[PDB]
Design a protein around this nucleic acid. Sequence first.
RNA 1: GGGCUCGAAGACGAUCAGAUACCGUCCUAGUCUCAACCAUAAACGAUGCCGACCAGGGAUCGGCGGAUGUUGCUAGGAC
Length: 80
Amino acid sequence: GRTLSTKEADIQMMLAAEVHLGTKNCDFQMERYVFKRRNDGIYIINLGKTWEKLQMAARVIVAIENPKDIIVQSARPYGQ
RNA sequence: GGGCUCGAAGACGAUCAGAUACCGUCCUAGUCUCAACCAUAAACGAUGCCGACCAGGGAUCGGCGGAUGUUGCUAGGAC
Ligand SMILES: [K+]
Ligand SMILES: [K+]
Ligand SMILES: [K+]
Ligand SMILES: [K+]
Ligand SMILES: [K+]
Ligand SMILES: [K+]
Ligand SMILES: [Mg+2]
Ligand SMILES: [Mg+2]
Ligand SMILES: [Mg+2]
Ligand SMILES: [Mg+2]
Protein backbone atom coordinates (compact mmCIF):
# COMPACT_ATOMS: atom_id res chain seq x y z
CA GLY A 1 0.00 0.00 0.00
CA ARG A 2 1.62 3.20 1.28
CA THR A 3 -0.53 5.61 -0.70
CA LEU A 4 1.54 8.50 -2.02
CA SER A 5 0.88 12.08 -0.99
CA THR A 6 -0.32 14.66 -3.51
CA LYS A 7 3.20 16.04 -3.92
CA GLU A 8 4.62 12.53 -4.42
CA ALA A 9 2.17 11.67 -7.20
CA ASP A 10 2.59 15.10 -8.79
CA ILE A 11 6.37 14.73 -8.93
CA GLN A 12 6.01 11.19 -10.26
CA MET A 13 3.81 12.52 -13.06
CA MET A 14 6.32 15.30 -13.76
CA LEU A 15 9.12 12.72 -14.01
CA ALA A 16 6.98 10.64 -16.37
CA ALA A 17 6.49 13.76 -18.50
CA GLU A 18 10.23 14.63 -18.37
CA VAL A 19 9.51 18.02 -16.78
CA HIS A 20 12.93 17.90 -15.07
CA LEU A 21 14.96 17.88 -18.32
CA GLY A 22 16.48 21.29 -19.04
CA THR A 23 18.67 22.49 -21.88
CA LYS A 24 22.47 22.63 -22.13
CA ASN A 25 22.53 26.28 -21.00
CA CYS A 26 21.35 27.84 -17.74
CA ASP A 27 20.28 31.43 -17.19
CA PHE A 28 22.02 32.99 -14.20
CA GLN A 29 18.61 33.90 -12.76
CA MET A 30 17.27 30.36 -13.27
CA GLU A 31 20.23 28.74 -11.50
CA ARG A 32 18.51 28.74 -8.09
CA TYR A 33 15.96 26.25 -9.47
CA VAL A 34 18.47 23.93 -11.17
CA PHE A 35 19.71 21.03 -9.06
CA LYS A 36 22.89 19.93 -10.86
CA ARG A 37 24.40 19.45 -14.31
CA ARG A 38 24.72 15.93 -15.70
CA ASN A 39 27.79 14.62 -17.51
CA ASP A 40 26.09 15.12 -20.88
CA GLY A 41 25.52 18.79 -20.03
CA ILE A 42 21.73 18.86 -19.59
CA TYR A 43 20.71 20.69 -16.43
CA ILE A 44 18.36 18.84 -14.07
CA ILE A 45 15.53 20.97 -12.67
CA ASN A 46 14.59 20.62 -9.01
CA LEU A 47 11.03 19.29 -9.18
CA GLY A 48 10.28 20.25 -5.57
CA LYS A 49 10.82 23.92 -6.38
CA THR A 50 8.72 23.43 -9.51
CA TRP A 51 5.86 22.03 -7.43
CA GLU A 52 6.16 24.84 -4.88
CA LYS A 53 6.09 27.44 -7.66
CA LEU A 54 3.05 25.73 -9.18
CA GLN A 55 1.30 25.99 -5.81
CA MET A 56 2.32 29.65 -5.52
CA ALA A 57 1.00 30.43 -9.01
CA ALA A 58 -2.27 28.66 -8.15
CA ARG A 59 -2.51 30.75 -4.98
CA VAL A 60 -2.07 33.92 -7.03
CA ILE A 61 -4.59 32.81 -9.66
CA VAL A 62 -7.30 31.76 -7.20
CA ALA A 63 -7.34 35.24 -5.64
CA ILE A 64 -8.56 36.84 -8.89
CA GLU A 65 -12.27 37.45 -8.36
CA ASN A 66 -13.16 37.35 -12.06
CA PRO A 67 -11.35 34.59 -14.02
CA LYS A 68 -12.05 36.51 -17.25
CA ASP A 69 -9.39 39.05 -16.21
CA ILE A 70 -6.72 36.33 -16.63
CA ILE A 71 -5.23 35.77 -20.09
CA VAL A 72 -3.09 32.72 -20.86
CA GLN A 73 -1.39 32.46 -24.25
CA SER A 74 1.12 30.21 -25.99
CA ALA A 75 3.11 31.20 -29.06
CA ARG A 76 4.37 27.69 -29.81
CA PRO A 77 2.08 25.08 -31.42
CA TYR A 78 2.62 22.51 -28.65
CA GLY A 79 1.18 24.64 -25.85
CA GLN A 80 -1.87 25.92 -27.74
C1' G B 1 80.35 48.11 -48.16
C1' G B 2 76.69 46.25 -51.22
C1' G B 3 73.79 47.34 -55.16
C1' C B 4 68.93 41.35 -57.09
C1' U B 5 64.33 43.65 -57.14
C1' C B 6 61.44 47.73 -57.28
C1' G B 7 61.99 52.67 -58.05
C1' A B 8 61.44 59.60 -56.20
C1' A B 9 64.29 62.72 -60.05
C1' G B 10 65.08 62.26 -65.28
C1' A B 11 64.21 60.40 -70.26
C1' C B 12 60.92 58.21 -73.77
C1' G B 13 55.99 55.71 -75.68
C1' A B 14 50.78 56.46 -75.26
C1' U B 15 45.94 59.00 -73.84
C1' C B 16 44.37 64.09 -74.16
C1' A B 17 42.06 70.30 -76.25
C1' G B 18 46.63 70.38 -73.16
C1' A B 19 48.68 65.78 -69.81
C1' U B 20 54.77 68.56 -66.73
C1' A B 21 49.73 62.94 -64.64
C1' C B 22 46.88 58.58 -64.12
C1' C B 23 48.66 53.61 -68.25
C1' G B 24 53.34 51.41 -70.60
C1' U B 25 59.03 51.17 -71.36
C1' C B 26 64.37 52.38 -69.41
C1' C B 27 66.43 54.25 -65.30
C1' U B 28 69.66 58.07 -60.98
C1' A B 29 69.22 58.81 -55.69
C1' G B 30 66.98 55.41 -52.62
C1' U B 31 65.47 50.59 -51.29
C1' C B 32 69.93 46.37 -47.87
C1' U B 33 74.17 46.61 -44.10
C1' C B 34 77.89 49.10 -40.95
C1' A B 35 79.53 53.91 -38.17
C1' A B 36 77.46 58.74 -36.99
C1' C B 37 73.08 61.94 -37.35
C1' C B 38 68.11 63.21 -37.69
C1' A B 39 63.39 62.84 -33.60
C1' U B 40 59.09 63.45 -36.94
C1' A B 41 53.90 60.07 -38.62
C1' A B 42 46.04 59.35 -39.08
C1' A B 43 53.70 57.57 -34.06
C1' C B 44 45.39 56.00 -33.51
C1' G B 45 42.03 52.95 -29.27
C1' A B 46 42.06 60.09 -32.88
C1' U B 47 40.44 57.50 -25.72
C1' G B 48 47.11 59.52 -19.59
C1' C B 49 48.75 56.55 -15.28
C1' C B 50 47.56 54.16 -10.34
C1' G B 51 43.35 52.32 -7.14
C1' A B 52 37.88 50.69 -5.74
C1' C B 53 32.96 49.22 -7.15
C1' C B 54 29.97 47.91 -10.99
C1' A B 55 25.23 42.67 -15.57
C1' G B 56 25.27 38.18 -18.09
C1' G B 57 27.48 34.64 -21.74
C1' G B 58 30.46 31.72 -24.98
C1' A B 59 35.21 31.42 -27.16
C1' U B 60 40.69 31.92 -27.01
C1' C B 61 46.46 32.47 -25.11
C1' G B 62 49.88 31.35 -20.60
C1' G B 63 50.23 29.11 -15.74
C1' C B 64 48.09 26.22 -11.99
C1' G B 65 44.34 22.72 -9.09
C1' G B 66 40.85 18.60 -9.56
C1' A B 67 38.23 14.50 -12.23
C1' U B 68 37.92 11.10 -16.00
C1' G B 69 38.43 7.84 -20.46
C1' U B 70 41.26 6.79 -24.82
C1' U B 71 46.15 6.89 -27.47
C1' G B 72 49.88 2.21 -33.75
C1' C B 73 53.07 7.02 -28.18
C1' U B 74 57.13 7.21 -24.23
C1' A B 75 54.73 8.52 -14.84
C1' G B 76 54.35 11.76 -18.61
C1' G B 77 52.70 14.12 -23.62
C1' A B 78 47.81 14.59 -27.05
C1' C B 79 42.49 14.89 -26.42
K1 LIG C 1 70.47 49.57 -57.05
K1 LIG D 1 62.54 57.14 -61.85
K1 LIG E 1 40.41 65.64 -72.18
K1 LIG F 1 64.12 63.16 -39.23
K1 LIG G 1 43.43 53.95 -35.94
K1 LIG H 1 39.90 33.81 -19.52
MG1 LIG I 1 63.21 47.78 -63.66
MG1 LIG J 1 67.73 54.71 -45.20
MG1 LIG K 1 53.47 65.06 -33.18
MG1 LIG L 1 44.80 26.90 -20.35
